[PDB]
């Protein structure tokens, strides 16, 4: 059946990553869930080049100190994107 494209899904995932880093109310699980979908999404160079700002945020959470898990999942995901891009 039809399903939304990676970039369409990315709109949600990127937003969840950002909501998970709310200073007022951070939510690690929210980031992890977004990261894990993003980790399986085909963010190949076609999508990656039009979504460089996402890669920019992924670099921020890979060093996240307020929650270790966020940094780990961001890392596993971010590295996987490099394995699909150019």
Swiss-Prot record:
Tissue: Widely expressed. High expression is found in heart, skeletal muscle, ovary and testis. Overexpression is frequently observed in hepatocellular carcinoma samples.
Compartments, as annotated in UniProt: Nucleus; Cytoplasm
Sites of Phosphoserine modification: 25
Interaction with DPF3/BAF45C isoform 2 as annotated region, ranges: 5-84
Signal peptide: none
Role noted for this protein: Acts as an epigenetic regulator of myogenesis in cooperation with DPF3a (isoform 2 of DPF3/BAF45C). Associates with the BAF complex via its interaction with DPF3a and HDGFL2-DPF3a activate myogenic genes by increasing chromatin accessibility through recruitment of SMARCA4/BRG1/BAF190A (ATPase subunit of the BAF complex) to myogenic gene promoters. Promotes the repair of DNA double-strand breaks (DSBs) through the homologous recombination pathway by facilitating the recruitment of the DNA endonuclease RBBP8 to the DSBs.
Entry similarity comment: Belongs to the HDGF family.
Subunit record text: Interacts with HDGF. Interacts with trimethylated 'Lys-36' of histone H3 (H3K36me3). Interacts with trimethylated 'Lys-79' of histone H3 (H3K79me3), but has higher affinity for H3K36me3. Interacts with IWS1. Interacts with H2AX, POGZ, RBBP8 and CBX1. Interacts with histones H3K9me3, H3K27me3 and H3K36me2. Interacts with DPF3a (isoform 2 of DPF3/BAF45C). Interacts with SMARCA4/BRG1/BAF190A, SMARCC1/BAF155 and SMARCD1/BAF60A in a DPF3a-dependent manner.
Name the UniProt record assigns to this protein: Hepatoma-derived growth factor-related protein 2
Species: Homo sapiens (Human)
